[PDB]
Amino acid sequence: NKNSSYFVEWIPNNVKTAVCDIPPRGLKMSATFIGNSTAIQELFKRISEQFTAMFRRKAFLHWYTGEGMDEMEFTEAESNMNDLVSEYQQYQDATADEQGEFEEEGEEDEA
Amino acid sequence: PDLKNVKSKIGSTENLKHQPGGGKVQIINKKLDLSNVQSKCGSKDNIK
């Protein structure tokens, strides 16, 4: 309620509760958080630019090709991480309002 | 008396053909050929 801006709007009521009777040894009570946010875009955003910083210049790469890997694979790992950061950014702040194909049928015309 | 002819024996009068003569010196320098040479790392074309 006080943090409506921090939830995605087309998954309703974004919480999984669960309660155990038994606390961790040496704590009278505790809770565990597992949160799934768009915010993780940040990880894949930083790592895929640092990765293009490397493979764009074949830097550090002779050590790995030198074990039987190929340049196609660096491209496919990259292709996918860039695709992946584009999927998390597609859903970063994605509407509960309809998405796309906004075209229509007209009015009847004199003959 | 008469001596007709007499001369000295033997020194600088018998040397007058042989100087001896001198010579000529030269260096002692070369180059190397650079025409084969290119850098041995080489990633910047990968911009392609």
Side-chain angles (χ1 to χ4, degrees):
Chain A
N1 182 235
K2 298 181 196 173
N3 299 132
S4 72
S5 58
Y6 307 136
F7 297 89
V8 102
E9 294 211 282
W10 39 287
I11 289 179
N13 317 77
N14 319 75
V15 188
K16 179 79 200 102
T17 52
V19 198
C20 174
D21 185 67
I22 300 301
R25 190 181 292 271
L27 285 172
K28 182 168 295 299
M29 67 162 36
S30 74
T32 309
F33 176 77
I34 310 69
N36 192 346
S37 185
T38 64
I40 207 56
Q41 183 180 353
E42 286 265 73
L43 184 51
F44 312 104
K45 192 184 175 172
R46 170 168 34 81
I47 291 159
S48 41
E49 184 195 103
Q50 292 169 298
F51 184 108
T52 294
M54 306 169 62
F55 163 55
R56 197 155 178 81
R57 295 178 311 99
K58 300 196 186 185
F60 290 101
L61 160 143
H62 59 285
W63 321 115
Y64 293 37
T65 55
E67 300 302 301
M69 195 170 194
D70 190 284
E71 323 183 342
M72 174 57 47
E73 311 267 54
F74 293 71
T75 305
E76 203 180 56
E78 172 175 82
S79 289
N80 199 9
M81 177 184 274
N82 286 296
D83 288 346
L84 195 49
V85 75
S86 301
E87 213 177 47
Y88 287 103
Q89 195 196 358
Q90 188 187 247
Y91 295 114
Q92 175 49 335
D93 203 33
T95 49
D97 188 354
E98 306 298 259
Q99 295 184 263
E101 204 186 356
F102 184 87
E103 298 176 63
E104 58 295 279
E105 195 94 56
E107 298 192 58
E108 193 162 82
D109 187 25
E110 194 173 323
Chain B
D2 195 351
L3 56 77
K4 317 289 172 185
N5 169 93
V6 55
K7 306 279 158 159
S8 58
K9 58 196 194 192
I10 322 173
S12 293
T13 38
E14 187 49 58
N15 217 132
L16 306 174
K17 303 178 289 194
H18 193 57
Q19 292 289 83
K24 40 188 77 164
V25 284
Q26 162 62 338
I27 55 162
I28 327 168
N29 186 80
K30 254 185 302 194
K31 299 295 181 72
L32 71 81
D33 184 358
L34 200 56
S35 66
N36 195 54
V37 174
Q38 33 162 25
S39 6
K40 298 172 168 196
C41 279
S43 72
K44 178 75 173 182
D45 84 290
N46 183 81
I47 291 312
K48 288 173 297 197

